Ligand binder design. Structure first.
Ligand SMILES: [Mg+2]
Length: 157
């Protein structure tokens, strides 16, 4: 029906947090935007270490939301222990499920690594802005030479 959606959880939370705080409400707001439109295939990746106690250099708000979304099978923790794999999981999953990635990160390093991921990101990256709690994706994500947001999120127009 609709393409699978993969949300770069950290990119969205930091964005909603004005790039100063990991804002978990940002993730929930992005998730709800897709849910409201009837999406059922939504995966949000976040590194497992975001479950730990906040260091003072890694502030986080509304942390309780992460386990709530995990319990709803929407959020999936990416592994980490005392290194991470976050961006690669995001891109690999979206690519292999022929879905879309929600992030403002363009993953330049991954683009240079595999050409198929370079082209995938060029065609499937959905960028956005937050205005306070308003999640705003572009109406024409690929421009005049592209589909409507509506069709961009669908397997077929
Ligand atoms: Mg990242």
């Amino acid at each position: 029906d609709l393409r699978p959606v993969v949300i770069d959880g950290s990119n969205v939370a930091m964005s909603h947090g004005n790039k100063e705080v990991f804002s978990c409400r940002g993730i929930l707001l992005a998730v709800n935007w897709f849910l409201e439109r009837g999406h059922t295939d939504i995966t949000v990746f976040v590194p497992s270490w975001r479950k730990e106690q906040p260091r003072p250099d890694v502030p986080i708000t509304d942390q309780h939301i992460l386990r709530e979304l995990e319990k709803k099978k929407i959020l999936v923790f990416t592994p980490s222990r005392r290194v991470c794999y976050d961006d690669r999981f995001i891109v690999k999953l979206a690519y292999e499920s022929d879905g879309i990635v929600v992030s403002n990160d363009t993953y330049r390093d991954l683009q240079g690594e595999r050409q198929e991921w370079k082209r995938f990101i060029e065609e499937r990256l959905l960028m956005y802005s937050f205005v306070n709690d308003k999640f705003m994706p572009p109406d024409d994500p690929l421009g005049r030479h592209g589909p409507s947001l509506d069709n961009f999120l669908r397997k077929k127009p």
